[PDB]
């Protein structure tokens, strides 16, 4: 039993809710919140901008030190950093950005990072400003993640469509 509430169960291991991931993180304090990161960990907008703002920019400060030491992530890759006031840990995962021309097949590689964590609160990778089709992102998620994932979808209209079209 865990503290996630109000989610629709899609499969054995994938759950979905119309929620603001920032508000959900602050209420649940999950072990892991996933950030929709870019390779530079520049958390300017979308989910990343919102998570970073909720940490009062502490996420960005930590991220800048990470990059200065380690260099950029790979598209499809991830790193574990602090969750600050939102979670124990933040798993920064880089899905492909269609608006940069990145290969969509890398979306499966991006979701494979979730399998290193038993339970996660997450957004749909490569959705929103990353330009992929969220219905496709949900399909890849369900077909790739085997650990327990709680998906937060900010837009109610999109949430209803994802549910209504889910096979
Ligand atoms: O274009 S996006 O930002 C790309 C990443 C996922 C979507 N965003 C969110 N999803 C869930 N909670 C959120 N709180 C603030 C933004 C947000 C759309």
Contact 127, 143 (CB under 8 A): no
Distance in Å, CA 126 to ligand 1 centroid: 10
CA distance 35 to 92: 5
User: What is the spatial distance between Cα 113 and Cα 144, in angstroms, rounded to a whole number?
Assistant: 10
Q: Which atom of ligand 1 is nearest to the CA of 46?
A: 3
**Structure solved via:** X-ray
| Ligand 1 and 50: CB distance under 6 A | yes
Ordered by start, the domain boundaries in the chain are 8-165
Of 120, 17, 136, give the one whose Cα is nearest residue 78.
Answer: 120
Resolution (Å) of this entry: 1.0
- Taking the C-alpha atoms of residue 155 and residue 18, their distance in angstroms, rounded to an integer, is 7
Q: Is the CB of 128 under 6 A from ligand 1?
A: yes
* CA 110 – CA 94 distance, rounded (Å): 6
Structural tokens at position 65: 């030190």
Per the CB < 8 A criterion, the answer to whether 16 and 153 are in contact is yes
150 DSSP β-pair partners = 15, 121
98 CB burial (10 A radius; 0-12, 13-18, 19+): middle
The span from the CA of 14 to the CA of 4, in Å, is 12
CB burial of residue 105 (10 Å; 0-12, 13-18, 19+)? exposed
Q: Which residue's structure tokens are 């603001």?
A: 20
HSE-up (13 A, CA, CB side) for residue 81:
26
- CATH number (3.40.50.2300, 1.10.1740.10, 3.10.310.30, 3.40.220.10) of 8-165 reads 3.40.220.10
Alpha carbon separation from 144 to 46, 108, 122 (Å, rounded): 23, 7, 14
Torsion of CA 158, 43, 149, 163, to 10 degrees: 0
């Amino acid at each position: 039993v865990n503290s996630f509430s109000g989610y629709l169960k899609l499969t054995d291991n994938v759950y979905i809710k119309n929620a603001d991931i920032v508000e959900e993180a602050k209420k649940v304090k999950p072990t892991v919140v996933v950030n929709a990161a870019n390779v530079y960990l520049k958390h300017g907008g979308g989910v990343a901008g919102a998570l970073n703002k909720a940490t009062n920019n502490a996420m960005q400060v930590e991220s800048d030190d990470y990059i200065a030491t380690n260099g950029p992530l790979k598209v499809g890759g991830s790193c574990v950093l602090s969750g600050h006031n939102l979670a124990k840990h933040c798993l920064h995962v880089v899905g492909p950005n269609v608006n940069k021309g990145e290969d969509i097949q890398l979306l499966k590689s991006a979701y494979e990072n979730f399998n290193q964590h038993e339970v996660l609160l997450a957004p749909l990778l490569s959705a929103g400003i990353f330009g992929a089709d969220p219905i496709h992102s949900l399909r890849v998620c369900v077909d790739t993640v085997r650990t327990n994932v709680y998906l937060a979808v900010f837009d109610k209209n999109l949430y209803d469509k994802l549910v209504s079209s889910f096979l």
